[PDB]
Design a protein around this nucleic acid. Structure first.
Ligand SMILES: [Mg+2]
Lengths: 116, 513, 626
RNA sequence: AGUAGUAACAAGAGGUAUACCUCUCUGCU
């Protein structure tokens, strides 16, 4: 069972195998008393084990880079978002392929014009 | 062109995979490939005997018999916790410097109960050494007060090893060493002994559908609703969660989730010690202030689980106020002590009652702990019943039947049978009853329930086909009755469900005179 | 008052609230121990239905085989395997007559699909027996071991990568009387008989987690050499079954309800004032133990008539391999003693040559009845199929029987149509009087008895047309309620933060599409998934009063950043999902809401940590098993 | 003892040798 394995592996202190160059950006101790890495390795591959507080530490206090290519790199997901939010809805008529969980049900249906 | 030919070994194999009157694979291929039929089926159906026919016997529910229920001892309780008998020690809005750690909360709830008398036995386990249960409770009561830390692990005494059953598995040898014993035999594979239906499980299902004064399940947030089907869904879901939250079945859901989660964490984390596990639920009042309720303790055993059915034993000690000497067939497995006295100052009188402690040796497996961690599916599935009926009324009326279905403040739905007749309640009583049915289908789940439900669904659909003037009929109804009735052996929930089907069949008999 | 939920059926019909009779929230039953008793029960029950066949000693494998077909006609209502083969060829010819160009187009597209299939198509799928280990394995490992063992000996035709060349290697490898296989060490040498028995072996286990059975049953996994031929035969039968309108397989979802409403609209269209119409809902008893593989050989030789002969041989291999199969009997038994207080374990290969004073009554009877079938620890299983292998050819045979009953073909006072899926059937019969309906039921049942199809008299029922059930699709008056699949647990699957988020949202979306998940149930499923997600990854909301190992840095991240509605859930932000936006990944839904320092800290490529989703720092890789 | 139900768990694999030992942190208002 992989779900149960994840559930008892997240309960332990160090569940994440981070790459061995993590020691040059983020320290060992926290400001709140938590350890962010030991000096262990994984099963044969030299990746040092960390805590998820390292991930939250990177998210709140990491090195800010530039991310402007993501409207073009992962463009189809933002295309899904823009075709959702610029589209207007309609009534519930009791009686496209992407939103067929939304506008075609068991008994009902729903008018849905897309963006534009 | 492509090429494929058989080797001689596979050719000698292929000459023996034919209808019996042939001898070569190419000869059978030449017979098949140039076959021009001349009505062989008419000759076979004129030559086949006349015993082979599907004769129709017409169905009439005013003449069929009731399902039989077996005979034996009364059926006893088999839940992992006490359902309608458990007592909870409560702390209103805790702040005690542990604040969420379960042993700290168990100590904070234990310190709010003075009245520890000397523990004696008042209902013996039938097959047990009951002094070991008494000394297990005395050892746990001693070892709680001397704990320093976040987890309690118990010392491996003799009585604790008996109560968890350590050393009871016989040794595993090689076959060639011991094949010369007169006593050696196969593992015992008898069918289970039958049990007569008792009278407590109907009381459990009665009390598992009543409202309580706490708010058990607390769901998360959802996004900004825009579409009209999202507004219809929000209407349905908010009525259901408003009507179903304060019931006892939600308390049983939360208690089972917490117990199985803690048991799996202590099994996969500390798989060597006798780790004390407490039984905690956390709720709110109707005023919004938090409350921590403690029900009892669970002493784990060793857990070297490699399969999905390997069993970890545990000892469950749960407080209660129900004197077991009034329904003593219900507690054949337990061993009940009398450990305290409690003062009830209520609106009528101000009395004292003895507080008992229910001790038993239970066992569980990994798949049962996994499926007990997911009892919240009950809260899903009952909704997918009730909402489904709404759609089942929206396809014969062709309108949104959401609003004239929850604004029906009137006793419309039949849900019960009193000695006055069939009783009707509102739609909220139906929601609580269907949640209680899913919870008790998840607590008492076994194979006999699967066989009984899967084989009685056809009797329900045959009665429905009769009542629509569709003229039903079957081919072998005695076999259908036997296929249902073989799946009723000793589970209390299956016996109660067969009694419910018998009462439904008598009710639909009495409907049409 | 005593509460009774079945009294709910006094107000609504049973078809509306039938979902209360599905107890699918507790643990399904599992089997503790060996599957030897169940597999020996399967073998004994299979050889007791085809008892009046002809016993012939097989030349190559040496095992005692049994040939039920072309045998004596049955004379009871017990299940029998005696399928007359001229009736089978007649039904396939009538199915060819009713559909012109069907068999030729299916065979043409199968020949088009044969010469462009690579061998790694065998790597897909479930587990597979591995005769080099005598153990189930994944398909890739078993395929790699078989290719390596073939590469050591002189069989290297699969160097070109194709699949038909690997089948050539498989067929050629039965020549070798000296198959040497490295076993756990000592490289032992198989003889020709031992390798030929090891190639034709099905590995039998107990099917765990099944719904609706009190007593357990056995299933089997094929070998590695017999996977490719079964794949090609099932490809041909799949290409046929998608064009017969009376086939419930392999379509699903909303494209199955149209079939039920279509056959009800067809068969009840032009009914006169006398034209009665009835409907049998039916299950088939003993669907596995009665369809003989030689009937399937006659079927795949009649379907491929007129095709090139290499095609007929390649598709005829799989019934020839299946009519000589053996069955490995599992993992033995467990003996105990309470005097000396000790237990032992016996294997399957000791069953033919042990003293029978160690067993109970019934198991000793089973060993005495199966003792004359043993070949090197395996039991010969020539009659009958086992479950899961030929799932579309059986549907082809049932559709042939349903296609017998047209008005132009029968010229009687009755006719029928309907659907057949796997071993589940719904049959609609039109006639003029009720006795015509009875004679039509008799003609259908007697015709099914001529091909091995046994309708179960216990679990079938007939009424007038309008309400029926086909594979847990419940039809009432034009409304279909679907309860075929189990309502799954909407928990995490256990990859990482972002992967489990995207997998959960797409799973709720596809359940709303396929399995008729209502909108309010979908909203409660979103709530349950986010609750279990926030527990599993310890990533509860920022303004909470809980405490875990992450709540310190989650608290600081919550208090420091300004636009708090833009953080992801694994950063303790608010859940943004609802019904209209389950198909959008979470990073794109909060893009314009994120303050740019948070977004830049998120999607930096330079971090050492790194479903159709984005990649962030939450897309980490978990700790491997030590 | 107990879970459970047509057969299993109630520790197993080893070393010196009947006794020890290596391996196989848990907070769902
Ligand atoms: Mg059916």
């Amino acid at each position: 069972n992989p779900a149960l394995r994840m559930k008892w592996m997240m309960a332990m202190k160090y569940p994440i195998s981070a790459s061995s160059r993590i020691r040059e950006m983020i320290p060992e101790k926290d400001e709140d008393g938590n350890t962010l890495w030991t000096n262990t390795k994984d099963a044969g591959s030299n990746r040092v084990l960390v805590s998820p507080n390292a991930v939250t530490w990177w998210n709140r206090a990491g090195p800010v880079s530039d991310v402007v290519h993501y409207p073009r790199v992962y463009k189809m997901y933002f295309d899904r978002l823009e075709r959702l939010t610029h589209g207007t809805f309609g009534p519930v008529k009791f009686y496209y392929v992407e939103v067929l969980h939304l506008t075609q049900g068991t008994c009902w249906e729903q008018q849905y014009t897309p963006g534009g | 062109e492509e090429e494929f030919s058989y080797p001689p070994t596979f050719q000698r194999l292929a000459n023996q995979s034919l209808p019996p009157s042939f001898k070569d694979y190419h000869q059978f291929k030449a017979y098949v490939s140039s076959f021009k039929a001349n009505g062989n089926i008419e000759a076979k159906l004129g030559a086949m005997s006349e015993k082979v026919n599907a004769q129709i016997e017409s169905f009439d529910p005013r003449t069929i018999r009731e399902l039989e229920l077996p005979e034996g001892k009364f059926c006893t309780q088999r839940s992992k916790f006490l359902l309608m008998d458990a007592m909870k020690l409560s702390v209103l809005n805790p702040a005690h410097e542990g604040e969420g750690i379960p042993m700290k909360d168990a100590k904070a709830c234990l310190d709010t109960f003075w009245g520890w008398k000397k523990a004696t036995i008042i209902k013996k386990h039938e097959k047990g050494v009951n002094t070991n249960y008494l000394m297990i409770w005395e050892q746990l009561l001693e070892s709680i007060k001397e704990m320093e830390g976040k987890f309690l692990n118990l010392k491996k005494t003799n009585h604790l090893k008996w109560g968890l059953g350590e050393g009871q598995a016989p040794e595993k040898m090689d076959f060639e060493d011991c094949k010369e014993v007169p006593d050696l035999f196969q593992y015992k594979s008898e069918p289970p002994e039958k049990r007569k239906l008792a009278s407590w499980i109907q009381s459990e299902f009665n009390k598992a559908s009543e409202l309580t004064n706490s708010n058990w399940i607390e769901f998360d947030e959802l996004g900004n609703d825009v579409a009209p089907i999202e507004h219809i869904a929000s209407r349905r879901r908010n009525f259901f969660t408003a009507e179903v939250s304060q019931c006892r079945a939600s308390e049983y859901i939360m208690k089972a989730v917490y117990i199985n989660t803690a048991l799996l964490n202590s099994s996969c984390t500390a798989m060597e010690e006798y780790q004390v596990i407490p039984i905690i639920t956390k709720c709110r009042d109707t005023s919004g202030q938090r409350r921590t309720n403690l029900y009892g303790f669970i002493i784990k055993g060793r857990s070297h689980l490699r399969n999905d059915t390997d069993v970890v034993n545990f000892i469950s000690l749960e407080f209660s106020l129900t004197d077991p000497r009034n329904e003593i067939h219900k507690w054949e497995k337990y061993c009940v002590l009398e450990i305290g006295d409690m003062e009830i100052r209520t609106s009528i009188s101000t009395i004292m009652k003895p507080v008992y402690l229910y001790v038993r040796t239970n066992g569980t497996s990994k798949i049962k702990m996994k499926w007990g961690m997911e009892m919240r599916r009950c809260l899903l599935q009952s909704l997918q019943q009730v909402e489904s009926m709404i759609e089942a009324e929206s396809a014969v009326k062709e309108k949104d039947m959401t609003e004239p279905f929850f604004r029906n403040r009137e006793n419309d739905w039949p849900i019960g049978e009193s000695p006055q007749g069939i009783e009707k309640g509102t739609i909220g009583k139906v929601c609580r009853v269907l949640l209680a049915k899913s919870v008790f289908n998840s607590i008492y789940a076994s194979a006999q329930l699967e066989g009984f439900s899967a084989e009685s669904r056809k009797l329900l659909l045959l009665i429905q086909a009769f009542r629509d003037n569709l003229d039903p009929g079957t081919f072998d109804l005695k076999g259908l009755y036997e296929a249902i009735e073989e799946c009723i052996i000793n589970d209390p929930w299956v016996l109660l469900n067969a009694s419910w089907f018998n009462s439904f069949l008598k009710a639909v008999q009495l409907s049409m005179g | 008052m005593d509460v009774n939920p079945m009294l709910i059926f006094l107000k609504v019909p049973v078809q509306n609230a039938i979902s209360t009779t599905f107890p699918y929230t507790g643990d399904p039953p599992y089997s503790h121990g060996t599957g030897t008793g169940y597999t020996m029960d399967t073998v004994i029950r299979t050889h007791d239905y085809s008892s009046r066949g002809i016993w012939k000693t097989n030349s190559e494998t040496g095992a005692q085989q049994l040939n039920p077909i072309d045998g004596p006609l049955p004379e009871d209502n017990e299940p029998s395997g005696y399928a007359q083969t001229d009736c089978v060829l007649e039904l396939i010819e009538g199915l060819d007559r009713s559909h012109p160009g069907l068999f030729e187009t299916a065979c043409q597209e199968t020949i088009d699909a044969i010469q462009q299939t690579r061998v790694d198509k065998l790597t897909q799928g479930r587990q597979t027996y591995d005769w080099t280990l005598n153990r189930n394995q994944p398909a890739a490992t078993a395929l790699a071991n078989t290719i390596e063992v073939f590469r050591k000996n002189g069989y290297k035709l699969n160097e070109s990568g194709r699949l038909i060349d690997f089948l050539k290697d498989v067929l050629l490898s039965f020549e070798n009387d000296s198959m040497e296989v490295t076993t756990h060490k000592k490289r032992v040498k198989l003889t020709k008989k031992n390798y030929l028995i090891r190639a034709l072996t099905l590995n039998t286990m107990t099917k765990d987690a099944e719904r609706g059975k009190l007593k357990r049953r056995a299933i089997a996994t094929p070998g590695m050499q017999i996977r490719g031929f079964v794949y090609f035969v099932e490809l041909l039968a799949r290409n046929i079954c998608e064009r017969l309108e009376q086939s419930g397989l392999p379509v699903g979802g909303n494209e199955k309800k149209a079939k039920l409403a279509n056959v009800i609209k067809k068969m009840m269209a032009k009914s006169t004032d006398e034209e009665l119409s009835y409907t049998i809902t039916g299950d088939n008893t003993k669907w596995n133990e009665n369809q003989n593989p030689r009937i399937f050989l006659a079927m795949v030789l009649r379907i491929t008539a007129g095709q090139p002969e290499w095609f007929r041989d390649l598709l005829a291999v799989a019934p020839i391999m299946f009519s000589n199969k053996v069955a490995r009997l599992g993992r033995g038994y467990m003996f105990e003693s309470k005097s000396m207080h000790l237990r032992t374990q016996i294997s399957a290969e000791n069953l033919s040559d042990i003293n029978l004073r160690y067993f109970n009554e019934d198991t000793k009877k089973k060993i005495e009845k199966i003792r004359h079938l043993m070949v090197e620890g395996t039991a010969s299983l020539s009659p009958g199929m086992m479950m899961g292998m030929f799932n579309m050819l059986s549907t082809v045979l049932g559709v042939s029987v349903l296609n017998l009953g047209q008005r132009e073909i029968l010229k009687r006072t009755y006719w029928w149509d309907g659907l057949q899926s796997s071993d589940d059937f719904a049959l609609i019969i039109n006639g003029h009087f009720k006795e015509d309906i009875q004679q039509g039921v008799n003609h259908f049942y007697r015709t099914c008895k001529l091909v091995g199809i046994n309708m179960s008299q216990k679990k079938s029922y007939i009424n007038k047309t309008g309400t029926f059930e086909f594979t847990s699709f419940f039809y009432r008056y034009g409304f279909v309620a679907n309860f075929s699949m189990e309502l799954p647990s909407f928990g995490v699957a256990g990859n990482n933060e972002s992967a489990d988020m995207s997998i959960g949202t797409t799973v709720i979306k596809t359940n709303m599409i396929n399995n008729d998940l209502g909108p309010a149930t979908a909203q409660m499923a979103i709530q349950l998934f986010i609750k279990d997600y926030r527990y599993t990854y310890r990533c509860h909301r920022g303004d909470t009063n809980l405490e875990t190992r992450r709540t310190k840095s989650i608290k600081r991240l919550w208090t420091e950043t300004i636009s708090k509605a833009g953080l992801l859930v694994a950063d303790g932000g608010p859940n943004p999902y609802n019904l209209r936006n389950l198909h959008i990944p979470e990073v794109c839904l909060k893009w314009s809401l994120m303050d740019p320092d948070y977004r830049g800290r998120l999607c930096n490529p330079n971090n050492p940590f790194v479903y159709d989703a984005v990649a962030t720092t939450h897309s980490w890789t978990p700790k491997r098993n030590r």
